[PDB]
Scaffold this active site. Structure first.
Site, PDB file in Angstrom:
ATOM      1  N   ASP A  97       0.834  -1.187   0.000  1.00  0.00           N
ATOM      2  CA  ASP A  97       0.000   0.000   0.000  1.00  0.00           C
ATOM      3  C   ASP A  97       0.878   1.249   0.000  1.00  0.00           C
ATOM      4  O   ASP A  97       2.065   1.205   0.334  1.00  0.00           O
ATOM      5  CB  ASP A  97      -0.925  -0.010   1.216  1.00  0.00           C
ATOM      6  CG  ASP A  97      -1.999   1.045   1.137  1.00  0.00           C
ATOM      7  OD1 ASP A  97      -2.952   0.850   0.357  1.00  0.00           O
ATOM      8  OD2 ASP A  97      -1.889   2.062   1.851  1.00  0.00           O
ATOM      9  N   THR A 129      -0.312   4.917   1.093  1.00  0.00           N
ATOM     10  CA  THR A 129      -0.493   5.874   2.176  1.00  0.00           C
ATOM     11  C   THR A 129      -0.243   5.214   3.525  1.00  0.00           C
ATOM     12  O   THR A 129      -0.801   4.154   3.824  1.00  0.00           O
ATOM     13  CB  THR A 129      -1.898   6.467   2.132  1.00  0.00           C
ATOM     14  OG1 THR A 129      -2.094   7.136   0.879  1.00  0.00           O
ATOM     15  CG2 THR A 129      -2.090   7.459   3.267  1.00  0.00           C
ATOM     16  N   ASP A 184      -5.835   5.417  -4.410  1.00  0.00           N
ATOM     17  CA  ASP A 184      -5.820   6.826  -4.770  1.00  0.00           C
ATOM     18  C   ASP A 184      -5.795   6.973  -6.293  1.00  0.00           C
ATOM     19  O   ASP A 184      -5.837   5.991  -7.041  1.00  0.00           O
ATOM     20  CB  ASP A 184      -4.630   7.518  -4.106  1.00  0.00           C
ATOM     21  CG  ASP A 184      -4.747   9.032  -4.114  1.00  0.00           C
ATOM     22  OD1 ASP A 184      -5.743   9.554  -4.657  1.00  0.00           O
ATOM     23  OD2 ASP A 184      -3.838   9.701  -3.577  1.00  0.00           O
ATOM     24  N   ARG A 210      -6.888   3.068  -7.713  1.00  0.00           N
ATOM     25  CA  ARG A 210      -8.352   3.134  -7.686  1.00  0.00           C
ATOM     26  C   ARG A 210      -8.992   1.751  -7.605  1.00  0.00           C
ATOM     27  O   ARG A 210     -10.066   1.521  -8.167  1.00  0.00           O
ATOM     28  CB  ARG A 210      -8.901   3.900  -8.892  1.00  0.00           C
ATOM     29  CG  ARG A 210      -8.510   5.365  -8.926  1.00  0.00           C
ATOM     30  CD  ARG A 210      -9.173   6.129  -7.791  1.00  0.00           C
ATOM     31  NE  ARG A 210      -8.888   7.560  -7.855  1.00  0.00           N
ATOM     32  CZ  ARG A 210      -9.282   8.440  -6.941  1.00  0.00           C
ATOM     33  NH1 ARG A 210      -9.978   8.038  -5.886  1.00  0.00           N
ATOM     34  NH2 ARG A 210      -8.978   9.724  -7.079  1.00  0.00           N
ATOM     35  N   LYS A 228      -8.351  -5.825  -4.407  1.00  0.00           N
ATOM     36  CA  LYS A 228      -7.031  -6.085  -3.842  1.00  0.00           C
ATOM     37  C   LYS A 228      -6.813  -7.575  -3.619  1.00  0.00           C
ATOM     38  O   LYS A 228      -5.750  -8.112  -3.949  1.00  0.00           O
ATOM     39  CB  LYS A 228      -6.857  -5.319  -2.531  1.00  0.00           C
ATOM     40  CG  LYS A 228      -6.723  -3.818  -2.691  1.00  0.00           C
ATOM     41  CD  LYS A 228      -6.523  -3.154  -1.341  1.00  0.00           C
ATOM     42  CE  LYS A 228      -6.399  -1.644  -1.464  1.00  0.00           C
ATOM     43  NZ  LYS A 228      -5.130  -1.245  -2.130  1.00  0.00           N
ATOM     44  N   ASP A 257      -1.963  -1.186   5.964  1.00  0.00           N
ATOM     45  CA  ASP A 257      -2.153  -0.566   7.266  1.00  0.00           C
ATOM     46  C   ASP A 257      -3.602  -0.490   7.727  1.00  0.00           C
ATOM     47  O   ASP A 257      -3.833  -0.260   8.919  1.00  0.00           O
ATOM     48  CB  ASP A 257      -1.560   0.854   7.271  1.00  0.00           C
ATOM     49  CG  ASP A 257      -2.175   1.750   6.208  1.00  0.00           C
ATOM     50  OD1 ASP A 257      -3.022   1.267   5.427  1.00  0.00           O
ATOM     51  OD2 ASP A 257      -1.805   2.942   6.146  1.00  0.00           O
ATOM     52  N   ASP A 283      -6.908  -3.476   3.359  1.00  0.00           N
ATOM     53  CA  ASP A 283      -5.926  -4.473   2.966  1.00  0.00           C
ATOM     54  C   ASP A 283      -6.100  -5.797   3.696  1.00  0.00           C
ATOM     55  O   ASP A 283      -5.398  -6.759   3.369  1.00  0.00           O
ATOM     56  CB  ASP A 283      -4.517  -3.921   3.211  1.00  0.00           C
ATOM     57  CG  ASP A 283      -4.191  -2.743   2.308  1.00  0.00           C
ATOM     58  OD1 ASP A 283      -4.680  -2.719   1.161  1.00  0.00           O
ATOM     59  OD2 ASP A 283      -3.470  -1.826   2.750  1.00  0.00           O
ATOM     60  N   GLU A 286      34.539 -39.818   4.972  1.00  0.00           N
ATOM     61  CA  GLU A 286      34.616 -40.860   5.990  1.00  0.00           C
ATOM     62  C   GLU A 286      34.250 -42.219   5.408  1.00  0.00           C
ATOM     63  O   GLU A 286      34.836 -43.241   5.781  1.00  0.00           O
ATOM     64  CB  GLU A 286      33.702 -40.513   7.166  1.00  0.00           C
ATOM     65  CG  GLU A 286      34.104 -39.255   7.926  1.00  0.00           C
ATOM     66  CD  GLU A 286      33.148 -38.927   9.062  1.00  0.00           C
ATOM     67  OE1 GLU A 286      32.128 -39.635   9.202  1.00  0.00           O
ATOM     68  OE2 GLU A 286      33.407 -37.955   9.805  1.00  0.00           O
ATOM     69  N   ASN A 311      33.302 -37.803  15.352  1.00  0.00           N
ATOM     70  CA  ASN A 311      31.948 -37.262  15.295  1.00  0.00           C
ATOM     71  C   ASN A 311      31.752 -36.178  16.349  1.00  0.00           C
ATOM     72  O   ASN A 311      31.207 -35.108  16.060  1.00  0.00           O
ATOM     73  CB  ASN A 311      30.926 -38.382  15.483  1.00  0.00           C
ATOM     74  CG  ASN A 311      29.507 -37.928  15.200  1.00  0.00           C
ATOM     75  OD1 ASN A 311      29.270 -36.790  14.804  1.00  0.00           O
ATOM     76  ND2 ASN A 311      28.553 -38.815  15.426  1.00  0.00           N
ATOM     77  N   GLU A 369      39.097 -31.803   8.193  1.00  0.00           N
ATOM     78  CA  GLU A 369      37.687 -31.465   8.309  1.00  0.00           C
ATOM     79  C   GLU A 369      37.448 -30.185   9.098  1.00  0.00           C
ATOM     80  O   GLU A 369      36.337 -29.646   9.051  1.00  0.00           O
ATOM     81  CB  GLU A 369      36.912 -32.631   8.934  1.00  0.00           C
ATOM     82  CG  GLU A 369      36.817 -33.838   8.005  1.00  0.00           C
ATOM     83  CD  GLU A 369      36.048 -34.997   8.606  1.00  0.00           C
ATOM     84  OE1 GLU A 369      35.692 -34.925   9.798  1.00  0.00           O
ATOM     85  OE2 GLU A 369      35.799 -35.984   7.883  1.00  0.00           O
TER      86      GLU A 369
HETATM   87  N1  LIG Z   1     -12.707  10.209   4.680  1.00  0.00           N
HETATM   88  C1  LIG Z   1     -12.729  10.528   3.265  1.00  0.00           C
HETATM   89  N2  LIG Z   1     -13.661  11.398   2.908  1.00  0.00           N
HETATM   90  C2  LIG Z   1     -13.775  11.771   1.613  1.00  0.00           C
HETATM   91  N3  LIG Z   1     -12.938  11.255   0.683  1.00  0.00           N
HETATM   92  C3  LIG Z   1     -11.988  10.371   1.039  1.00  0.00           C
HETATM   93  C4  LIG Z   1     -11.872  10.001   2.318  1.00  0.00           C
HETATM   94  N4  LIG Z   1     -10.864   9.122   2.403  1.00  0.00           N
HETATM   95  C5  LIG Z   1     -10.358   8.952   1.177  1.00  0.00           C
HETATM   96  N5  LIG Z   1     -11.048   9.723   0.333  1.00  0.00           N
HETATM   97  C6  LIG Z   1     -10.836   9.844  -1.088  1.00  0.00           C
HETATM   98  O1  LIG Z   1     -11.529   8.588  -1.835  1.00  0.00           O
HETATM   99  C7  LIG Z   1     -10.657   8.016  -2.619  1.00  0.00           C
HETATM  100  C8  LIG Z   1     -10.534   6.512  -2.254  1.00  0.00           C
HETATM  101  O2  LIG Z   1      -9.497   6.370  -1.330  1.00  0.00           O
HETATM  102  P1  LIG Z   1      -9.439   5.007  -0.411  1.00  0.00           P
HETATM  103  O3  LIG Z   1      -9.800   5.355   1.013  1.00  0.00           O
HETATM  104  O4  LIG Z   1     -10.399   3.974  -0.949  1.00  0.00           O
HETATM  105  O5  LIG Z   1      -7.901   4.422  -0.462  1.00  0.00           O
HETATM  106  P2  LIG Z   1      -6.652   5.141   0.330  1.00  0.00           P
HETATM  107  O6  LIG Z   1      -5.467   5.208  -0.600  1.00  0.00           O
HETATM  108  O7  LIG Z   1      -7.067   6.541   0.716  1.00  0.00           O
HETATM  109  C9  LIG Z   1      -6.296   4.163   1.877  1.00  0.00           C
HETATM  110  P3  LIG Z   1      -4.528   3.611   2.078  1.00  0.00           P
HETATM  111  O8  LIG Z   1      -3.933   4.339   3.259  1.00  0.00           O
HETATM  112  O9  LIG Z   1      -4.504   2.128   2.372  1.00  0.00           O
HETATM  113  O10 LIG Z   1      -3.712   3.888   0.838  1.00  0.00           O
HETATM  114  C10 LIG Z   1      -9.304   8.724  -2.390  1.00  0.00           C
HETATM  115  O11 LIG Z   1      -8.853   9.254  -3.554  1.00  0.00           O
HETATM  116  C11 LIG Z   1      -9.557   9.844  -1.360  1.00  0.00           C
HETATM  117  O12 LIG Z   1      -9.173  11.158  -1.959  1.00  0.00           O
HETATM  118 CA   LIG Z   2      28.041 -37.123  12.727  1.00  0.00          CA
HETATM  119 CA   LIG Z   3      -2.734   2.805   3.924  1.00  0.00          CA
HETATM  120 CA   LIG Z   4      32.267 -36.011  10.740  1.00  0.00          CA
END
Ligand SMILES: Nc1ncnc2c1ncn2[C@@H]1O[C@H](COP(=O)(O)OP(=O)(O)CP(=O)(O)O)[C@@H](O)[C@H]1O
Ligand SMILES: [Ca+2]
Ligand SMILES: [Ca+2]
Ligand SMILES: [Ca+2]
Ligand SMILES: [K+]
Length: 968
Positions: free
Chosen positions: A333, A335, A600, A651, A657, A676, A680, A744, A769, A881
């Site tokens: 991942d 972020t 993202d 995306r 995933k 994280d 995932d 041996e 041995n 040896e």
């Molecule tokens: N709390 C929130 N509110 C509004 N939009 C959000 C949001 N969190 C993420 N987004 C936006 O939605 C889209 C989807 O992001 P998503 O949350 O699915 O993966 P991520 O990359 O942010 C989590 P990771 O830390 O695992 O990479 C992102 O482009 C983000 O800009």
């Molecule tokens: Ca041995």
């Molecule tokens: Ca993350």
């Molecule tokens: Ca030996």
């Protein structure tokens, strides 16, 4: 206390707590002083493996031979059991010593990262250690958190609450909780829907309750009381295959020597001769069988795990170490994992003027890069007062009320409450000061929440629609305080749902030419040198009625986001970790193909892979990157083909995933996912190895086979290195014992074929041995990492353990070691200073000793059975040896580039064995069982002269290995 059924009012009155404030410092003290905090033979026994069972039988049958009061020698028979039993307990103590040191490093690592919990007390929500939670505290936890203790639900901040009870009940499907009372006390735990039990995970919802049990009184603590990587199954097969080969030779040696039973050396009887060669077969078996093979396993694994604790990396699955070694590709991942996980809004833009396809621009930059509520708004190197602009005021409203996101007095820094991305929207509002409110009179904890408290008073929050990762938006609906809907989400997803744009305060419909004006800047911020995350900020000016809307289905919320009005978009900076650029570079050198699976925008992901090293700046991306919507729009022929070439994915939904990992596993690609969050978790489970950061969700940590206390990504490269450092050490362990113990076997077969008196006494065969196959072999588990450990290609589990060329060097070294110890004993008969001069074609048949046998007179009488050739054979056998042990430091690297002192554990081991060899020959009472001390001046100069070229025999094949390195 067992207060479970009755309502929330009576359980809060039982502890005498307030739901808003909570317990105080002196109330937690007493409650902590009443219940407490919230939390050898089998150790010594390594003898369970199959190979150890053989020597235990050999030590018992040797103990029975000593019970007959003769043993051919009253004192010699007593030594045979001790020689066999000493090597067994020595390898056991050394292996337990490393497990001793391995357990000491794990306990010190537990203190380094204690589990955490979110509580409300008298001193905003705060987070403390999990062991400091006492009954009565008010705990609020959300999706992804691990339930620290037994909690009675007092409030639910969502429409539903799901809890994963897989650890307690075994139910993989989450159950829905509630705050309503339950009828019966002694009902099963599956019927308790008003209780949060420790160890369980929150699947959905955000709730807050009171703790009723801690430490031992925890419900899950009541039941808590009371193989590794088929390589070991292959090692169990290797130990079984090698034992049957040795067992076939030993029973064959007893048959080959059936004609020598009646020789005068044995006493002139078939029974007297069969027993002596039965001891030859047993002494050959024990010498050839690897003794420290179960010990070198524990040695290497306890060394590797203790090296990972030094680098602050938890290993939750014991066999998951060498699985990292055979990892073909890794996908991680972005972020929080590849970034420093520090969000802060640095750029911001709105719409200035719109007419047709022509649209103007304005760019607001934010100074300071921290979570602190201090900064200055600037545009074109000039400060800007954001009170005049109604769009920025409405933009600040979206950043504040659509968010639910504390000053640390100990370290003097501001820490985030909730997610980091939403936290950057909170500090952005504090830096604006849109209403021009005085902020100096307030304290630090009051300044960080000053501007948000004013907006909270101006606009009341009615209800919130939770964020979902499929629709990529979070919707909230507000109302002025005395009795508007605005949404934030992904830029490419919200703008499509925005049919209007508000130039300043005037709302006009969306223009396709102006839509592209906004997206072009979002791409420039995403694909620029800054690599910023963008958040579209919109507002629905035709809000639907509350009860006319339905909050049961989260996927139906897209209908609620129709006809939006675009307000603006903000940029956030999260720099990558300073070590990730080198991590992918070493992964490229190790043949590991790095993949970026994130959710993202692709414009932000492809710019990262160019900066980090996944993609080259000179490299172009034609078909090596895809979006989640493009990944689904590819033909099945190109669907699987893309999984093999593409090193980046953007995306993608949490369901996609887990599939990408499944498509890689279909091509037999060993994968490793690093994540994280709960996004995932389906991928971490499905993948072979899961990795979770120390600041990540506890659900990701539970499914991950590794947890990084230090969230630095450079540990992933070192983790694969250590799994590849245990593999080559197990190679060098087998490389040492096989190539040495084959000599041996060549020794005994050569003395019988050449026609000389047999090489060694059964006790002389058991002694080598204890010296050659013992602690010098176990010390190979401590070998330093090879020079080319991270450049050679990875391991394929489909291929056999021993290569074709490696089997050749096992014989090539065995031929010289076997002939050297025989030629040494041969040297004493052919030409010796203190010995006789009897060559005349080696007198091939020595069986003719008396009397003055015709046509072989001999210069002296029969001198066979003299220890001088037998000890000469053993003196070289132990010396040659030990010279072979120096060759086992590296696989193909010359010893002039791998100095012998790189492994300190082996140098002191050889000196201890050679001193034990010298203590044995030179101390007067010992050479009765053993035979006779050899000469010091001339013989050891000859032993060294013969035992030295075995190093040349090994380095010349490493020259061939350095010429071309192939398995063959
Ligand atoms: N709390 C929130 N509110 C509004 N939009 C959000 C949001 N969190 C993420 N987004 C936006 O939605 C889209 C989807 O992001 P998503 O949350 O699915 O993966 P991520 O990359 O942010 C989590 P990771 O830390 O695992 O990479 C992102 O482009 C983000 O800009
Ligand atoms: Ca041995
Ligand atoms: Ca993350
Ligand atoms: Ca030996
Ligand atoms: K897994």
């Amino acid at each position: 206390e067992n207060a479970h059924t009755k309502t929330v009012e009576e359980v809060l009155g039982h502890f005498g707590v307030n739901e808003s404030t909570g317990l105080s410092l002196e109330q937690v003290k007493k409650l902590k002083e009443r219940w407490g905090s919230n939390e050898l033979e089998l150790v010594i026994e390594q003898f369970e493996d199959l190979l150890v069972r053989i020597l235990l039988l050999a030590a018992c049958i040797s103990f029975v031979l000593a019970w007959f009061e003769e043993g051919e020698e009253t004192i010699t028979a007593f030594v045979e059991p001790f020689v066999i039993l000493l090597i067994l307990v020595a390898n056991a103590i050394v292996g337990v010593w490393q497990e001793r040191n391995a357990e000491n490093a794990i306990e010190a690592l537990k203190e380094y990262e204690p589990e955490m919990g979110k509580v409300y007390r008298q001193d905003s929500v705060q987070r403390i250690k999990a062991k400091d939670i006492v009954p009565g505290d008010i705990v609020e936890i959300a999706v992804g958190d691990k339930v620290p203790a037994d909690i009675r639900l007092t409030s639910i901040k969502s429409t539903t609450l799901r809890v994963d009870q897989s650890i307690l009940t075994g139910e993989s499907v989450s159950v829905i909780k509630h705050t309503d009372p339950v009828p019966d006390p002694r009902a099963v735990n599956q019927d308790k829907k008003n209780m949060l039990f420790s160890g369980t995970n929150i699947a959905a919802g955000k709730a807050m309750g009171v703790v009723v049990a801690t430490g031992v009184n925890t419900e899950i603590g009541k039941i808590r009381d009371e193989e590794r990587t088929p390589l070991q199954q292959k090692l169990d097969e290797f130990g079984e295959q090698l034992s049957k080969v040795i067992s076939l030779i030993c029973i064959a040696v007893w048959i080959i020597n059936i004609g020598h039973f009646n020789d005068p050396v044995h006493g002139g009887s078939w029974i007297r001769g069969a027993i002596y060669y039965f001891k030859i077969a047993v002494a050959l078996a024990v010498a050839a069988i690897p003794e420290g093979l179960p010990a070198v396993i524990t040695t290497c694994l306890a060394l590797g795990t203790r090296r990972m604790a030094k680098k602050n990396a938890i290993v939750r699955s014991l066999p998951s170490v060498e699985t990292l070694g055979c990892t073909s590709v890794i996908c991680s991942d972005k972020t929080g994992t590849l970034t420093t996980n520090q969000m802060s809004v640095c750029r911001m833009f709105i719409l200035d003027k719109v007419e047709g396809d022509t649209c103007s621009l304005n760019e607001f930059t934010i100074t300071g890069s921290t979570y602190a509520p201090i900064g200055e708004v600037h545009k074109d190197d000039k400060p800007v007062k954001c009170h005049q602009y109604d769009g920025l005021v409405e933009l600040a409203t979206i950043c504040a009320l659509c968010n639910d996101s504390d000053y640390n007095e100990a370290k003097g820094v501001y820490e985030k409450v909730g997610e980091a991305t939403e936290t950057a929207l909170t500090c952005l509002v504090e830096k604006m000061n849109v209403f021009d409110t005085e902020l100096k009179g307030l304290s630090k904890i009051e300044r960080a929440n000053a501007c948000n408290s004013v907006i909270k008073q101006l606009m009341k929050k009615e209800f919130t629609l939770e964020f979902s990762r499929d629709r990529k938006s979070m919707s909230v609906y507000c109302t002025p305080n005395k009795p508007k809907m605005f949404v934030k989400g992904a830029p490419e997803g919200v703008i499509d749902r925005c049919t209007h744009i508000r130039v300043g305060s005037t709302k006009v419909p969306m223009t396709p030419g102006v839509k592209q004006k906004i997206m072009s800047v979002i791409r420039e911020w995403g694909s620029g040198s800054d690599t910023l995350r963008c958040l579209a900020l919109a507002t629905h000016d035709n809000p639907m009625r509350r009860e006319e809307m339905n909050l049961e289905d989260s996927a139906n919320f897209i209908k609620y986001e129709t006809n939006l009005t675009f307000v603006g978009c903000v940029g956030m900076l999260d720099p990558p970790r300073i070590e990730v650029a080198s991590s992918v570079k070493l992964c490229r050198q190790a043949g590991i193909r790095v993949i970026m699976i994130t959710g993202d925008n692709k414009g932000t992901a492809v710019a990262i892979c160019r900066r980090i090293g996944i993609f080259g700046q000179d490299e172009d991306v034609t078909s090596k990157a895809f979006t989640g919507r493009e990944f689904d729009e590819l033909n099945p022929s190109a669907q699987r083909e893309a999984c093999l070439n593409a090193r980046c994915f953007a995306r993608v939904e949490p369901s996609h995933k887990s599939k990408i990992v499944e498509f890689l596993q279909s091509f037999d690609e060993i994968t490793a996912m690093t994540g994280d969050g709960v996004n995932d978790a389906p991928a971490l489970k499905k993948s072979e190895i899961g990795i979770a950061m120390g600041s990540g969700t506890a659900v990701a940590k539970t499914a991950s086979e590794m947890v990084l206390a230090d969230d630095n990504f450079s540990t992933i490269v070192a983790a694969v290195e250590e799994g590849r450092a245990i593999y080559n050490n197990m190679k060098q362990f087998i490389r040492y014992l096989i190539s040495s113990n084959v000599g041996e076997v060549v020794c005994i077969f050569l003395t019988a074929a050449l026609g000389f008196p047999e090489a060694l006494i059964p006790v002389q065969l058991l002694w080598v041995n204890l010296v050659t196959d013992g602690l010098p072999a176990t010390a190979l588990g401590f070998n330093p990492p090879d020079l080319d450990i991270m450049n050679k290609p990875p391991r394929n589990p489909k291929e056999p353990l021993i290569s074709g060329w490696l089997f050749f060097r096992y014989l090539a070294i065995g031929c010289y070691v076997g002939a050297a110890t025989v030629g040494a004993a041969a040297w004493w008969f052919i030409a010796a200073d203190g010995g006789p001069r009897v060559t005349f074609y080696q007198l091939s048949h020595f069986l003719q000793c008396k009397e003055d046998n015709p046509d072989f007179e001999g210069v002296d009488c029969a001198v066979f059975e003299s220890p001088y050739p037998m000890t000469m054979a053993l003196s070289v056998l132990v010396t040659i040896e030990m010279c072979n042990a120096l060759n086992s430091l590296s696989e193909n690297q010359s010893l002039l580039r791998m100095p012998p002192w790189e492994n300190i554990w082996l140098v002191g081991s050889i000196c201890l064995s050679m001193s034990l060899h010298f203590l044995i020959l030179y101390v007067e009472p010992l050479p009765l069982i053993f035979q006779i001390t050899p000469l010091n001046l001339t013989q050891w100069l000859m032993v060294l002269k013969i035992s030295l070229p075995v190093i040349l025999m090994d380095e010349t094949l490493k020259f061939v290995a350095r010429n071309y390195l192939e398995p063959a």
